[PDB]
Design an enzyme around this catalytic site. Structure first.
Site, PDB file in Angstrom:
ATOM      1  N   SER A  89     -12.240   9.952  -4.160  1.00 32.86           N
ATOM      2  CA  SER A  89     -11.821   9.753  -2.756  1.00 32.86           C
ATOM      3  C   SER A  89     -10.260   9.731  -2.797  1.00 32.86           C
ATOM      4  CB  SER A  89     -12.309   8.422  -2.245  1.00 32.86           C
ATOM      5  OG  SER A  89     -11.807   7.348  -2.999  1.00 32.86           O
ATOM      6  N   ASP A 116      -6.777   7.874  -0.632  1.00 32.53           N
ATOM      7  CA  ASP A 116      -6.263   6.881   0.347  1.00 32.53           C
ATOM      8  C   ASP A 116      -5.096   7.565   1.123  1.00 32.53           C
ATOM      9  OD1 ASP A 116      -7.892   4.785  -0.625  1.00 32.53           O
ATOM     10  OD2 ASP A 116      -6.413   4.290  -2.108  1.00 32.53           O
ATOM     11  N   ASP A 118     -12.780   7.600  -8.259  1.00 30.53           N
ATOM     12  CA  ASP A 118     -14.023   8.128  -7.734  1.00 30.53           C
ATOM     13  C   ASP A 118     -13.893   9.438  -6.993  1.00 30.53           C
ATOM     14  OD1 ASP A 118     -13.002   7.353  -5.171  1.00 30.53           O
ATOM     15  OD2 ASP A 118     -14.790   6.220  -4.588  1.00 30.53           O
ATOM     16  N   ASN A 122      -8.096   8.389  -5.848  1.00 27.71           N
ATOM     17  CA  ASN A 122      -8.845   7.323  -6.595  1.00 27.71           C
ATOM     18  C   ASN A 122      -9.727   7.952  -7.683  1.00 27.71           C
ATOM     19  OD1 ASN A 122      -9.142   6.212  -3.401  1.00 27.71           O
ATOM     20  ND2 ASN A 122      -7.892   5.201  -4.877  1.00 27.71           N
ATOM     21  N   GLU A 132       0.778  -1.213   0.000  1.00 29.82           N
ATOM     22  CA  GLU A 132       0.000   0.000   0.000  1.00 29.82           C
ATOM     23  C   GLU A 132       0.838   1.307   0.000  1.00 29.82           C
ATOM     24  OE1 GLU A 132      -2.951   0.262  -0.741  1.00 29.82           O
ATOM     25  OE2 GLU A 132      -4.135  -1.341   0.086  1.00 29.82           O
ATOM     26  N   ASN A 161      -9.206   4.860   2.966  1.00 31.91           N
ATOM     27  CA  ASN A 161      -9.970   5.689   2.039  1.00 31.91           C
ATOM     28  C   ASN A 161     -11.030   6.616   2.637  1.00 31.91           C
ATOM     29  OD1 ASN A 161     -12.413   5.564  -0.117  1.00 31.91           O
ATOM     30  ND2 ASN A 161     -10.444   5.693  -1.102  1.00 31.91           N
TER      31      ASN A 161
HETATM   32  C1  LIG Z   1       5.123   1.811  -3.064  1.00 33.17           C
HETATM   33  N1  LIG Z   1       3.682   1.528  -2.926  1.00 33.17           N
HETATM   34  C2  LIG Z   1       3.005   2.816  -3.168  1.00 33.17           C
HETATM   35  C3  LIG Z   1       3.301   0.488  -3.923  1.00 33.17           C
HETATM   36  C4  LIG Z   1       3.676  -0.926  -3.672  1.00 33.17           C
HETATM   37  N2  LIG Z   1       5.071  -1.452  -3.809  1.00 33.17           N
HETATM   38  C5  LIG Z   1       5.821  -0.811  -4.964  1.00 33.17           C
HETATM   39  C6  LIG Z   1       5.810  -1.396  -2.494  1.00 33.17           C
END
Ligand SMILES: CN(C)CCN(C)C
Ligand SMILES: CN(C)CCN(C)C
Ligand SMILES: [Cl-]
Ligand SMILES: [Cl-]
Ligand SMILES: [Cl-]
Ligand code: NA
EC number: 3.2.1.17
Length: 129
Positions: A50, A52, A48, A46, A35, A59
């Site tokens: 929103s 994150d 839509d 996003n 993430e 979100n």
């Molecule tokens: C770096 N985040 C945003 C994406 C997932 N991988 C590349 C770690």
């Protein structure tokens, strides 16, 4: 703040995520990896409208208020900016509500696509916990 891997695992453990709703610590560390690359300040818009926020990319459509997501909710009762803090307390408390919402960690599409079904314990291997 960009956490180290073991540093984040320790912080998530202290805050009670290890085995929370049956998800071992490695699941949460894996999710954060994909993430946010462990960056508390990560934000992503996003399609839509929103956004994150934070280490677990929470979100604004349901979970936090950012003042710019029309028709949204703020179920964690926090400003989305609180999710960018170096102190992960807010992200953890909100993540516990999210993972309790019925779909478990499938709420995080990156978890489902990159972590589920894999050897997640690798994400905590070597850490002093
Ligand atoms: C770096 N985040 C945003 C994406 C997932 N991988 C590349 C770690
Ligand atoms: C590479 N993943 C699976 C583990 C992380 N550490 C040991 C670098
Ligand atoms: Cl694990
Ligand atoms: Cl809003
Ligand atoms: Cl579940
Ligand atoms: Na919102």
């Amino acid at each position: 703040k960009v956490f180290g891997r073991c540093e984040l695992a320790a912080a998530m453990k202290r805050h009670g995520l290890d085995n929370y709703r049956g998800y071992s610590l490695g699941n949460w560390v894996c999710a954060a990896k994909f993430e946010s690359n462990f960056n508390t300040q990560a934000t992503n818009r996003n399609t839509d409208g929103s956004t994150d926020y934070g280490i677990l990319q929470i979100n604004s459509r349901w979970w936090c208020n950012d003042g710019r997501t029309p028709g949204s909710r703020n179920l964690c009762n926090i400003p989305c900016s609180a999710l960018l803090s170096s102190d992960i307390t807010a992200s953890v408390n909100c993540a516990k509500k999210i993972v309790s919402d019925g779909n478990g960690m499938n709420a995080w599409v990156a978890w489902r696509n990159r972590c589920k079904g894999t050897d997640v314990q690798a994400w905590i291997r070597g850490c002093r916990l």
